[model samples]
Target: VPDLTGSGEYLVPDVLQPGLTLVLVGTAPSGISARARAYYANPENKFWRTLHAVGLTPRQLVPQEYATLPQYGLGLTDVAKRHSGVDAALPGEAWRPDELRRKVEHYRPRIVAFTSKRGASETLGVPTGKLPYGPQPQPLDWPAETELWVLPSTSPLGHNHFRLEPWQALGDRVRELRGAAEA
Candidate 1:
């Protein structure tokens, strides 16, 4: 439990920038991701593939290419930054919504898309099962003028229930916001 948290250092550094169009937050890095020092590095995870499939990336990218995400006005982060493990392996206290709030407040991304309902649920104080994918009706104090979207997890464990609809919706939403922001 101690290793799952503490030190305040993230397994993979946040690829964040002020005024970005979107920030995709996850629960935490998978063990493979922590080792690679890249977000969604697990080969079984569809994160990188989904980004390309949704037209968010020019092409399917390897996990190591994560640093290039903001080229499309997107970024990445996680709720439990210091840890890397499966959802069940994480301690209950590993969910750190306060840290996420600080980052969102400072970065001011137009959208903060949680990579899974768990992160969104914990952040908004909503129950996970009750949460629907896509843009939440209310921002839930996420950040001023910042939209919150809950996308299905790309983790292999989430494959059984995974749906691309929300991811596609996010792609469309960010493209519009990025277009407007650039205008």
Candidate 2:
């Protein structure tokens, strides 16, 4: 497991302007990401590759480019502020739903896309055994203006069953949301 003791607190970006099409949320920052002061900065992580594959980005984005999310009218955050050596070490109680709720209220993005089902369920206060992606039977306790989308984990640790195409579909959905919002 990665050493998390030396990892500093992760920083979250402010919401993008004029309403965002998608607000991508993760479970928590990995040790390497927190150490690098970048979201999904761990080189082994497939987030940037997945973004490029999904056509959300024209080219593969470097971890440093995370701040440029506002350029695409997209936002990024995490379900929890606490960091653990590994994702499995994190418990649902570690998440700060109130903080997320505040962000949702502040940003009011059209869609809240959780990078993994663990994040989605944790943020939504659902139990851990639920499905990792797709529409949920219940709405999130946030603003009615916001929609929820659970996307497959972009982490390299994820299985092959959760591949790029499904994530691309989620990206396409974000594009549609952006178009509708801009209309």
Candidate 3:
């Protein structure tokens, strides 16, 4: 495990709380994220800004404020919790689908969205190249009522593959779910 989390364990410890509306999963922390000890800490990453643009957050949040996401009914995590780097730089053994499943099942978030298809594929044992965007079919053993979504990577490095439409759709669903809960 990288000491990036400052706890000398995982690279970026999962930011999760029970009954969250959404939990975003990434492949792993970038070098920038590792150094800053925050998820998507790289300025070049659109993860923070996009959340505001799509209305998933009331305002644009800085990466350092990741821990506050549960207040907005959101959470954050990664497939490779013990690793930190670009997808290609991650060690094969560091990708732990079991750990991802365990965390999601434990927290039981209403929605679990993979920020990148690569992360979803790694955790789902699916072929990365063929994974679709937006809501995914429920996997067996997932928490009942837990939805799955696959969103474009918000990294500027994946600019060509990024799409705001999926994020917008996710934002709408998250809002609807939260609104329904309130009513």
Backbone clashes in model 2, listed as residue pairs: none
Best by lDDT: 3
lDDT of 2 by residue, 58-118 (tens): 7887887887876776778787766544568876566776777777877688777788878
Off by over 4 Å in 1: 1-8
Worst 10 residues of 1 by lDDT: 1-10
lDDT of 3 at 8: 59
Which of the two candidates, 2 or 3, achieves a greater lDDT against the reference?
A: 3
Identify the candidate with maximal TM-score.
Answer: 3
- As for lDDT, the candidate ahead, 1 or 3, is 3
Per-candidate TM equals 0.91, 0.83, 0.94
- What lDDT would each prediction earn against the true structure? 0.84, 0.71, 0.87
Tens-digit per-residue lDDT, 42-133, candidate 1: 89899999999998888999999988888888888888887779988998888888878877887888888999998888788878999988
Tens-place lDDT digits, model 3, residues 129-175: 88899998888667768899999999988899999999999999999
Please rank every candidate by TM-score, starting with the best: 3, 1, 2
Q: Report how far residue 42 has shifted in candidate 1, in Å.
A: 1.0
**Model 1: how far residue 74 lies from native, Å:** 0.6
| CA RMSD per model (angstroms) | 3.5, 5.2, 2.6
